[PDB]
Design a binder for this molecule. Sequence first.
Ligand SMILES: Nc1ncnc2c1ncn2[C@@H]1O[C@H](COP(=O)(O)OP(=O)(O)NP(=O)(O)O)[C@@H](O)[C@H]1O
Ligand SMILES: Nc1ncnc2c1ncn2[C@@H]1O[C@H](COP(=O)(O)OP(=O)(O)NP(=O)(O)O)[C@@H](O)[C@H]1O
Ligand SMILES: O=C(c1ccc(F)c(F)c1Nc1ccc(I)cc1F)N1CC(O)([C@H]2CCCCN2)C1
Ligand SMILES: [Mg+2]
Ligand SMILES: [Mg+2]
Lengths: 304, 276
Amino acid sequence: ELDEQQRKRLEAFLTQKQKVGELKDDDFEKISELVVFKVSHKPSGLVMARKLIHLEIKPAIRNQIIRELQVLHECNSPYIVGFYGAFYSDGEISICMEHMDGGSLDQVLKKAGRIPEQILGKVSIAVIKGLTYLREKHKIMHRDVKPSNILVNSRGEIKLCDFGVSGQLIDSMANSFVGTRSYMSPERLQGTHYSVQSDIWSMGLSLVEMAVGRYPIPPPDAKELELMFPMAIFELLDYIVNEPPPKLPSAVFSLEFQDFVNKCLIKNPAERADLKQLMVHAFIKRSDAEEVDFAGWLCSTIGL
Amino acid sequence: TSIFLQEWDIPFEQLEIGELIGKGRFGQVYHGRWGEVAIRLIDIERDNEDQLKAFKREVMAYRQTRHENVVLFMGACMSPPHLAIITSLCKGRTLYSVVRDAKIVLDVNKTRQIAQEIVKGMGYLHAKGILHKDLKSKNVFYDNGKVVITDFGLFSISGVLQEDKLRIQNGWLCHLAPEIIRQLSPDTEEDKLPFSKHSDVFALGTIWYELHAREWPFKTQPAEAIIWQMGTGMKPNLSQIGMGKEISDILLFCWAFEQEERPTFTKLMDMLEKLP
Ligand SMILES: Nc1ncnc2c1ncn2[C@@H]1O[C@H](COP(=O)(O)OP(=O)(O)NP(=O)(O)O)[C@@H](O)[C@H]1O
Ligand SMILES: Nc1ncnc2c1ncn2[C@@H]1O[C@H](COP(=O)(O)OP(=O)(O)NP(=O)(O)O)[C@@H](O)[C@H]1O
Ligand SMILES: O=C(c1ccc(F)c(F)c1Nc1ccc(I)cc1F)N1CC(O)([C@H]2CCCCN2)C1
Ligand SMILES: [Mg+2]
Ligand SMILES: [Mg+2]
């Protein structure tokens, strides 16, 4: 759980973070929309991504948010996006972080058709290693891993994002958005005790969506998997709780991969594989010792 | 196509608009002077004939209302895109703030009494065939024992839901009866949710919980979890804080899974009378 090429980049990012001192609004110039905007710090030559969460509550709670948020300066990993600072400005708290020029795998999957199995193996090692770091070194669970918050770059790192560091900032949020693609585990939907196992379920489900090119619930009929190769929120969620979990098509993916997702998508979280098990699963042992130019596949598909 | 302020029985010469009282999702609500009044300004499409006459449907109905537990509706003037609903101004604080204020004691006698006031108002509105559709403690006002219900009917014309991701406010879902919860989608429209007198009674049940726990139910849980738990009919009780069976049986009735088993506001008033 240590590498050198990775060793070079971490201090270098630390060195970069030396640049920042303190932050506030006029330091920053809006470049584009990705809510989070890519912005350019002028006091220091860094290009960062800054996310703006709109909260409107009195400072005693906002000060608690930022102290709890300050711990991210300390978590530092080759599998976690890099953090620079959090301040409050004009009814919005800003989190500015390392900018990843490739976007989310949500966004990568839109441009690609489907993501091939070997790249998905690599991303599995990255995600599994990130949660293990967090659990073991910060005693935190992610609580929402899914494609939109896993970021990729032309240099070839795959890292996690948007995890639950400040219990109170989640508290302070007035309203949530629910669409038709849910990645919440069956046990969280039922409101029972949960652990990093819930993140493992979310990871399995994300993997199947990226492999097939479609969010897999409800499962497609014979007609649309053939061509590949109007639902209310409550009944989608009830599908997740009471129907059997999704599965990869048996023809087009290796058994190791199928079994890997099947172990992630077990409904009972006690029987679901935990973090170390997956590190010893056949699928990622095979994938760990493999040569894919992930940066190469990326740039060619996205155009950079 | 038009609603002018001379159509109302409140003689009106001038209307002053003062400071904004607070932020909210449906229009803006300012202080006003007429005595003092609360003025809610709403914006509409220049020619959305559909929604403009739909709106007028509702507001002539309000003209027939007068009841000590319902805020006095005073008038509505139209001129697209700008509409205004003028009501009496509530002294005091919302029930939302009172329950969450640690310096105010809320004993079981008083909670029964507050609840009984809300029911009287609601049975009046129901008796006149008006559904609230957004009953909740931020829409009830309490000033040293005077309890008034506000913002009834607004939700139809509200647009508080407004791509393919439905916006959910904290507190909303736990007031929605299961029949409604089981139908939310990102295509859902306020004017087409299956509200009913039974759904209003459900919403009163959430207030009874909130009166005694001094917090909303499902406070811990994210929206998706709340939708599934409520849609399959899982509901909390008040035994964890030592509330007796009688105070808990009203919830069993108001939150009943099949609507027709939930009481009308008339029967519920009786049930509240029989508490210790
Ligand atoms: N550091 C980043 N670099 C590049 N794109 C990013 C970055 N962070 C977020 N994005 C993109 O910004 C868009 C919105 O992301 P975000 O504001 O985090 O909300 P979301 O991921 O879409 N939904 P949620 O994950 O629940 O908060 C997505 O297209 C993300 O891929
Ligand atoms: N009749 C009234 N008298 C005094 N204050 C009022 C009255 N009606 C509304 N308000 C206040 O005006 C502000 C805006 O209210 P409103 O637009 O109804 O939203 P809300 O009920 O507080 N919450 P929401 O409907 O979920 O957005 C709040 O601070 C209310 O307490
Ligand atoms: O952004 C956040 C978020 C939440 C809490 C928190 F403490 C943060 F610091 C957050 N951001 C953040 C964290 C670390 C880094 I390194 C970079 C970041 F931008 N999200 C959680 C989310 O999933 C929403 C929307 C979907 C449902 C659940 N809440 C998206
Ligand atoms: Mg995000
Ligand atoms: Mg209101």
